[PDB]
Amino acid sequence: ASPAANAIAYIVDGMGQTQISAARYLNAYKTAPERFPLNVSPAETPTGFDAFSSRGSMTTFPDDPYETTTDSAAAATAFASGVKTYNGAIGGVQTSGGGFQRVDTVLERASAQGYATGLITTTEATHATPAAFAAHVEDRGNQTEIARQYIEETQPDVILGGQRRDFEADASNGGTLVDAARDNGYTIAETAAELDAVDDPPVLGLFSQESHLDYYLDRKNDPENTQPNLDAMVDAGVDLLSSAGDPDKGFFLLVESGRVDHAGHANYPAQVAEQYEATQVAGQLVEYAETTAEPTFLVSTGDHECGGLTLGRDSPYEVEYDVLAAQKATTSRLRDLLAGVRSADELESIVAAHTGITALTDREVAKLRDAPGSISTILAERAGIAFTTDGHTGTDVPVFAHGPNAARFDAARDNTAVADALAAALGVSL
Amino acid sequence: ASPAANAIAYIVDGMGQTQISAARYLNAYKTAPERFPLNVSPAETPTGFDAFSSRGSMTTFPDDPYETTTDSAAAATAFASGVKTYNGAIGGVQTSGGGFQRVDTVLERASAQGYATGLITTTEATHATPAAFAAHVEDRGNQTEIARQYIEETQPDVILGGQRRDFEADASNGGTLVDAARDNGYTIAETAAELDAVDDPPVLGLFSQESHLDYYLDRKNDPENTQPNLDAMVDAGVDLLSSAGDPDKGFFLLVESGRVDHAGHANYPAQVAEQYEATQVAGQLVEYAETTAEPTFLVSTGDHECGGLTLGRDSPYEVEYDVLAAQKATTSRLRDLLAGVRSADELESIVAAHTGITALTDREVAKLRDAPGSISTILAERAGIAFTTDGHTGTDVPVFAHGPNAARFDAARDNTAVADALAAALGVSL
Ligand SMILES: [Cl-]
Ligand SMILES: [Cl-]
Ligand SMILES: [Cl-]
Ligand SMILES: [Cl-]
Ligand SMILES: [Cl-]
Ligand SMILES: [Cl-]
Ligand SMILES: [Cl-]
Ligand SMILES: [Cl-]
Ligand SMILES: [Cl-]
Ligand SMILES: [Cl-]
Ligand SMILES: [Cl-]
Ligand SMILES: [Cl-]
Ligand SMILES: [Mg+2]
Ligand SMILES: [Mg+2]
Ligand SMILES: [Mg+2]
Ligand SMILES: [Mg+2]
Ligand SMILES: [Mg+2]
Ligand SMILES: [Mg+2]
Ligand SMILES: [Mg+2]
Ligand SMILES: [Mg+2]
Ligand SMILES: [Mg+2]
Ligand SMILES: [Mg+2]
Ligand code: NA
Ligand SMILES: [Zn+2]
Ligand SMILES: [Zn+2]
Ligand SMILES: [Zn+2]
Ligand SMILES: [Zn+2]
Incomplete structure (x- = not known):
């Protein structure tokens, strides 16, 4: 038998060491503000990543004609197939x-051996990270062809993410790809409630009509939101992928917290809270790995850093973690809440209801009146905190x-090492 | 006997994971520009840090009434004594x-046991990093009291750094602290040549009259510079600290590449080249550790990150490593070279002689004419590249x-762990 019955790749898209540290601090502040920052020590407050027995560093560059910094598509192809490629x-x-030329992926090889396979993400289901494990396209933007390959070719047992619109494209026969998926035995889930109601795999969970799932703060705090959180998707996914039989053939699972990256591109301070959810899910995965009957191999990394986040801005040796701890809505939701509001008192009221700010300046009022995204x-x-780039x-x-x-990861490694490690764990070639 | 005969703490002041990555890339570009960036893989081009068998991450916060981000003084006191303290x-x-209240340091304890002890740095010899290992002061700015404690109290066998001015202060009797040092058997070295000429320890090397040693690019490329490089100071220091006798009592050594931090505060792109020298010295130290008769324990870390360096600026997925590779003088030296030059041709000539720039724009000419530090x-x-903070x-x-x-370092650790590890290695208490 191979070294592991189950293997899980957990990608946090956009996560570098600064995002991780920001979330470590935020966690410590939320746990015990009076003790902070003395309780930031990993000897005092272990985080989800600290639960991993080994850590190292990973180079992320692509094999691109012009760009030295990777995109997600190139990095995920490295994670999935063990080869460098061009951006996109x-x-x-x-x-x-x-x-x-197509290259095989660890998911396809694991499936050929009898492992159950899944893809779980907070982004569009056909976005570049999961796509590299279960599809092959020259351009990452061809999301309807990626959807067609998920449903008609690769057929992962669990697919959880956003953007039902991709699956409303035409199948090779009959109706849409949702129809094709149901033909192959998939249940379709569109809300957290419907996911919990699923009784048997395979499952295609599509939790937004278009685009990504909401950011973590908005899922958590918006009473109208019907999407599952990452912890719930992982819990559902692992149960559906795991069945008596094997015992040497469990499952291969890709899990992605994909919107740390999105917050970086937007320069949204909620990147820190998104990372906080991502680190919690890392802890959940270690907890699971320790419970399994047969061994479970886990590997987790970022595809690249996004935003040029720094824990400090301009000059002072201080970050105000209470601002991040008290934030209950991202800028994306606050733009909607503040749209068309002109009155200072009303702007202040809305801001106060969703953040720790209790008093705005006249200037901040002018900015929000002008453009809520400010x-x-x-x-x-x-x-x-500060960002250097979009x-x-x-x-x-x-x-x-x-x-x-x-x-073997207590070392500097290249990103292609992820694919090699996963293949070794599951005992497959390529 | 204890686990190790020799222990070395190597601090790179201001080094975070981004500085390290920038230097990894620079190294790969200098090695094989045609292959770049494919040869950045640690499987293709090992760097000095990759030679270390283990790596982890370290929290850096101080126990300060106001600041959440450490200064060097607080971090070095943690490295040396295993306790959190206030900034300064x-x-x-x-x-x-x-x-x-004074706390004991690993250096003092190692000395009490019979280990030879040294401090080697590219900063002023009495700057905060080495000072925490061999002196005790409520304020890091009291550099003449730090010098007095080095010479009259702690007496490390090797002291190598900058700023002779501190040692020209009054001793408790007689003349200056240089006089006191000679009274105790020290040879004074003021240039690279004089250091090489030293035949027996103890040695007090002071390679600048005031302030720090020059930055690495300027030491390397300025024909008038008489200072030793870090590799040469380490080589001299290790030979002087190492003698037949023991064999269980070798030496404890602090080595600091201290000006990565300075380049960060200044937002000088030469921070990358300074880090390149620092990583090379890390490799040198591993090479040494592997050669020793008895075991050698090495631990290396940054005290904190400085500058908010990011590998990307504004938007593109590209860094131009050739600009950094071709730079032969830091901004500090270029300010002197360009001072008072008005002519476009002359400005362009000077820039071209010391960088890879072959043509300046009219705008760049105007900036340099106005203020060469631009x-x-x-x-x-x-x-x-970009910086977010000074x-x-x-x-x-x-x-x-x-x-x-x-x-034990394949883990998240607190900075106080460094002192505990060093003490364990040398078999001392505290
Ligand atoms: Cl097997
Ligand atoms: Cl196909
Ligand atoms: Cl259904
Ligand atoms: Cl936000
Ligand atoms: Cl505030
Ligand atoms: Cl590797
Ligand atoms: Cl001993
Ligand atoms: Cl004293
Ligand atoms: Cl002398
Ligand atoms: Cl510079
Ligand atoms: Cl250029
Ligand atoms: Cl620790
Ligand atoms: Mg197996
Ligand atoms: Mg992604
Ligand atoms: Mg089950
Ligand atoms: Mg300042
Ligand atoms: Mg504050
Ligand atoms: Mg010993
Ligand atoms: Mg220092
Ligand atoms: Mg010797
Ligand atoms: Mg852009
Ligand atoms: Mg370029
Ligand atoms: Na490690
Ligand atoms: Zn990405
Ligand atoms: Zn991105
Ligand atoms: Zn420092
Ligand atoms: Zn500094």
Whole structure:
């Protein structure tokens, strides 16, 4: 038998060491503000990543003609297939002899051996990260072809994410890809309630009509939101992927917290809270790995850092974590809440209902009256954090591993190492 | 006997994971520009830090009444004594019962056991990092009292750094502290040549009259510079600290690359080249550790990150490493070279002689004519890197360990862990 019965790749898209540290601090502040920051010590307050037995660093560059910093598509193809590729490539490489060539993925190989397989993400289900594990396209933007390959070709047992619109494209016969999915035995789930109601795999969960699931703060705090949180999707997914039989053939699972990246591109201070949810899910995964009858291998990393986040802004040696701890709505939701409001008292009331701000300045009122999306800069300034870019940055990022052969990650590794480790754990070739 | 005969703490002041990554990339570009960035993989081009058998992450916060981000003094007191303290404290803590109280350091304890001891840095010899290992003061700015304690109290066998001015202060009797040092058997070395000429310890090397040693690019490229590089100071220091006798009692050594921090405060792109020298020295130290008759324990980390460096600026997924590779002089030296030059051709000539820039724009000419120190921003823009702050940032930083019990650092640790590890390695209490 192979070293592990189950293998899980957990990608936090956009996570570098600064996002992780920001969330470590936030966690400590929320736990015991009086003790803070003395309780930030990992000896005092273990976080979800600290539960991983090994950690190292990982280089993230692509094999691109122009860009030195990777996109998600290139990085995920490395995680899934163990090869470097160009930015925007999904599940293949550009060859000098023969144009685009598909490469196999660890998911496909695990499926061929009898492992159950899943993809779970907070982004559109067909976005680049999960797509590289279960589809092959020259351009990551071809999301209806990615959906067609999920349903007609690869057929993962669990697919959980956003954007039902992709699956409303035409199937190769009959109706839409939702129809094709039901033909193959899939239950379709569109809300958290419907997911909990699922009684048997396979499952196609599509929790938004278009675009990504809401950001973590908005899922948690918006009473109208019907989407599951990442912890609930993982819990549902692992139960559906795990069945008596095996015992050497469990499952391969991709889990992605995908919107840390989105918050970075937007320069939204809620990137920290998104990372907080992501780190909690890392802890959940270690807890699961320790409970299993047969061994479980876990590997977790960021695809690249996004936003150039720094824990400090301009000059002072202080960050105001209370601003981030008290924030109950992201800038995306606050833009909607503040739209068309002109009165200072009403602007102040809305801000106060969803953040720790109790008094706005006349200037902050003018900014929000003009453009509610300026609340992101108001909050970043009040927190004392900064972003340098609306793009990705080229830093090496942390990698974490747990389970058999996890100590091979107590090293600097390349991102292609993820695919090699997963393949070794499941005992497959490529 | 204890686990190790020799222990070395190597602090890179201001180093976070982004500085390390920037230098990894720079190294790969200098090695094989045609292959770049594919040769950045740690499987293709090992760097000095990759040679360390274990790595983890380290929290850096102080126990300060106001600041959440550490200064060097607080972090070094943690590294040396295993306790958290306030920003600016050297070798002591503020107690609620009795004001400032000294705490013992690993250096003092190792000395009491018979280990030879040294301090080697590119900063002023009495700057906060080395001071915390060999002095005790309520305020890091009291550099003449730190010098007095080095010479009259702690007496490390090797002291190498900058700023002879501190040692020209009055001794408790007789002349100056240089006189006191010679009274105790020290040879004084003031240039690289004089250091090489030293035949027996103890040695007090002071390579600048005032302030720090020059930045690495300027030491390397300025024909008038008479200062030793860090590799040469370490080589000299290790030979002087190591003698037949023991074999269980070798030496404890603090080594600091201290000016990565300075470049961060200045937002100088030469922070990357300074880090490149620092990573090379990390490799040198591992090479040494592997050669020793008896075991050698090494631990290396940053005290905190400085500057909010990001590998990307504004938007693009590209950094231009050739700009950093071709830079032969820091902004500090270029300010002197360009001072009072008005002619466009002459400005362009000077810039071209010391960088990879071959053509300036009319605008860049205007900036340099106005204020030569603007070359730092010209270079950061041409490289595509960015800084967010002229201060420290609060991110966790990498830690590296090698030798006996190095795998205890394959974990998230607090900065106080450094002192505990060093004490365990040398077999001392506190
Ligand atoms: Cl098996
Ligand atoms: Cl196909
Ligand atoms: Cl259904
Ligand atoms: Cl936000
Ligand atoms: Cl506030
Ligand atoms: Cl590797
Ligand atoms: Cl001993
Ligand atoms: Cl004293
Ligand atoms: Cl002398
Ligand atoms: Cl510079
Ligand atoms: Cl250039
Ligand atoms: Cl610890
Ligand atoms: Mg197996
Ligand atoms: Mg993604
Ligand atoms: Mg089950
Ligand atoms: Mg300042
Ligand atoms: Mg404050
Ligand atoms: Mg010993
Ligand atoms: Mg220092
Ligand atoms: Mg010797
Ligand atoms: Mg952009
Ligand atoms: Mg370029
Ligand atoms: Na490690
Ligand atoms: Zn990404
Ligand atoms: Zn992105
Ligand atoms: Zn420092
Ligand atoms: Zn500093």
